[PDB]
Ligand binder design. Structure first.
Ligand code: HEM
Ligand SMILES: O=c1cc(-c2ccccc2)oc2c1ccc1ccccc12
Ligand SMILES: O=c1cc(-c2ccccc2)oc2c1ccc1ccccc12
Ligand SMILES: O=c1cc(-c2ccccc2)oc2c1ccc1ccccc12
Ligand SMILES: O=c1cc(-c2ccccc2)oc2c1ccc1ccccc12
Length: 450
């Protein structure tokens, strides 16, 4: 009555496809001490998260998830009548900046082009001569600075000590999440001294310390915001949006907002850049379009988003091709329910394999081939690209990140031409972990004319 019996796992998102190509689109595995249901087909995923949304809108009660954002994290909070309220106002407030309305063209846009302009500088200048440089560190800083200005209005300068403290936080966080995830499925590691416990204890103090940082900006904001003024950033907007929830939920969602923003947008920029170098034809087609729609005396902006159907097509498939978020945040069942004729008890840990969707040869004919033209005359097969999830837990920053990413590649593609390194293999290897990042690579960025 239940899906193929738990197979001890590990024997990562690819192994899941290997066992989905043997025991069907839905199977179970024993993960350390936790039993997990893996969904792979789009049928299984859409039928679970969309048609049976409420039944799957939950989250496990993992140790990792408890200290993040001071316990009121939206990304990891359980499914509650109060979480539903948080999500509703969270999603609505952050998409208010995705749009082209006044709010958005004030906070997001001119901070993005402000940092994009700064980034093409450091690239063009870092490749001076025939020099080559690794762009990955510059995508982390760029993404951290933009969301800094978006959540607290503070667009730091790369000298700033407070900013070098944010970058340092993000690094330590990425270096200890592994330990946190290991304590989630092997909780017996908190019983005796070990490296994972020391790293997990470091993990949790890291979150306490950073949520403390965000909660400081919350007061200085609330203390300083006159009642008739429009929001200077996204924490002002959340202050204005105030069952009902504690005042402390405001900085908790703003910590989630900044947090989930870092490694994801960083990883995306790295994919967009390496793809330009390994696929010069699309680089040429992309930028040449920007000329026909933006000219050559002004940097692109949000007003050009609809008149640039290809730059988005290049984005929508960059996401499909890499699927750098191959598995969403673990889900949990709110009650007993059915999937593909399989019984699922309540409170079961369920994984969601997005990579299986974006690489099922049936759905996308030649999945391992890069061709943005898939999404062109598109409108609603770009919504089939599953890099953000679907259902009640779908990313609340979907539209904010494709709007922010677009501006980055448009300003970058508008100003410069990106060249690969000849000493490097024409192939793109993949670096797995947290996200699927392109293994270290070099590029030479030059200022173009056309
Ligand atoms: C390319 C950039 C991004 C990608 C690919 C991405 C992807 C995802 C994924 C896969 C999830 C888990 C969904 C699930 O478990 O079903 C998620 C959740 C979430 N994302 Fe993003 N994300 C990105 C950027 C952002 C940004 C910029 C924000 C905020 C401005 C954000 C805010 C959130 C939040 C709050 C959640 C938790 C929502 C919930 O659990 O109800 N993300 N995202
Ligand atoms: O401080 C964080 C760092 C990071 C992080 C992740 C990868 C690399 C570097 C930092 O993520 C988060 C953070 C905080 C809250 C989050 C809530 C939901 C999802 C992610 C969050
Ligand atoms: O515990 C996790 C395991 C895993 C995981 C990843 C690959 C294979 C098995 C589990 O992923 C996540 C976990 C927790 C939070 C996450 C947030 C965003 C994206 C992924 C997350
Ligand atoms: O076997 C693994 C278990 C786990 C794991 C980690 C924490 C809890 C449970 C399983 O993660 C990975 C595994 C294998 C490869 C990975 C590659 C990149 C990122 C994570 C990987
Ligand atoms: O971005 C993440 C990726 C991952 C992750 C874990 C395993 C494989 C790939 C990504 O985990 C987390 C993330 C963020 C916050 C977390 C908080 C508690 C526990 C795990 C978290």
């Amino acid at each position: 009555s239940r899906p193929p019996g738990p197979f001890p796992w590990p024997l990562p998102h690819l192994s899941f496809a290997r066992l989905a190509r043997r025991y069907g689109d839905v199977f179970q595995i024993r993960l350390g001490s936790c039993p997990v249901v893996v969904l792979n087909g789009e049928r299984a995923i859409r039928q679970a998260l969309v048609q049976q949304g409420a039944a799957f809108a939950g989250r496990p009660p993992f140790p990792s998830f408890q200290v993040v954002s001071g316990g009121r994290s939206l990304a990891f909070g359980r499914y509650s009548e109060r979480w539903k309220v948080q999500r509703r106002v969270a999603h609505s407030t952050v998409r208010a900046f995705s749009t082209g309305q006044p709010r958005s063209r004030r906070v997001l846009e001119q901070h993005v082009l402000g940092e994009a302009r700064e980034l093409v500088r450091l690239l063009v200048r870092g490749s001076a001569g025939g020099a080559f440089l690794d762009p990955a560190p510059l995508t982390v800083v760029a993404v951290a600075n933009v969301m800094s200005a978006v959540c607290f209005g503070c667009r730091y300068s790369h000298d700033d000590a407070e900013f070098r403290g944010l970058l340092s936080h993000n690094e330590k966080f990425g270096r200890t999440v592994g330990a946190g995830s290991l304590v989630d499925v092997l909780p017996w590691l908190q019983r005796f001294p070990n490296p994972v416990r020391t790293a997990f204890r470091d993990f949790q103090q890291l979150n306490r310390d950073f949520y403390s940082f965000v909660l400081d900006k919350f007061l200085r904001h609330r203390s300083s915001l006159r009642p008739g003024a429009a929001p200077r950033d996204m924490m002002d907007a959340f202050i204005h949006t105030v069952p009902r929830l504690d005042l402390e939920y405001v900085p908790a969602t703003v910590t989630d907002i900044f947090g989930a923003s870092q490694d994801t947008l960083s990883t995306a920029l790295q994919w967009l850049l390496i793809l330009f170098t390994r696929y010069p034809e699309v680089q040429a087609r992309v930028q040449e379009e920007l000329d026909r729609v933006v000219g050559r005396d002004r940097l692109p902006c949000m007003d050009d988003q609809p008149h640039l159907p290809y730059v988005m097509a290049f984005l929508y498939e960059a996401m499909r091709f890499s699927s750098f978020v191959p598995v969403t945040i673990p889900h949990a069942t709110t009650a007993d329910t059915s999937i593909m004729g399989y019984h699922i008890p309540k409170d079961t840990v369920v994984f969601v394999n997005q990579w299986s969707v974006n690489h099922d040869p049936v759905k996308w004919p030649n999945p391992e081939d890069f061709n943005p033209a898939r999404f062109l005359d598109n409108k609603d097969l770009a919504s089939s690209v599953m890099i953000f999830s679907v259902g009640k837990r779908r990313c609340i920053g979907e539209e904010l990140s494709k709007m922010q990413l677009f501006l980055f590649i448009s300003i970058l593609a508008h100003q410069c031409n990106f060249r690969a390194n000849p000493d490097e293999d024409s192939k793109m290897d993949f670096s797995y972990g947290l996200t699927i990042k392109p293994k270290s690579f070099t590029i030479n960025v030059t200022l173009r004319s056309t």
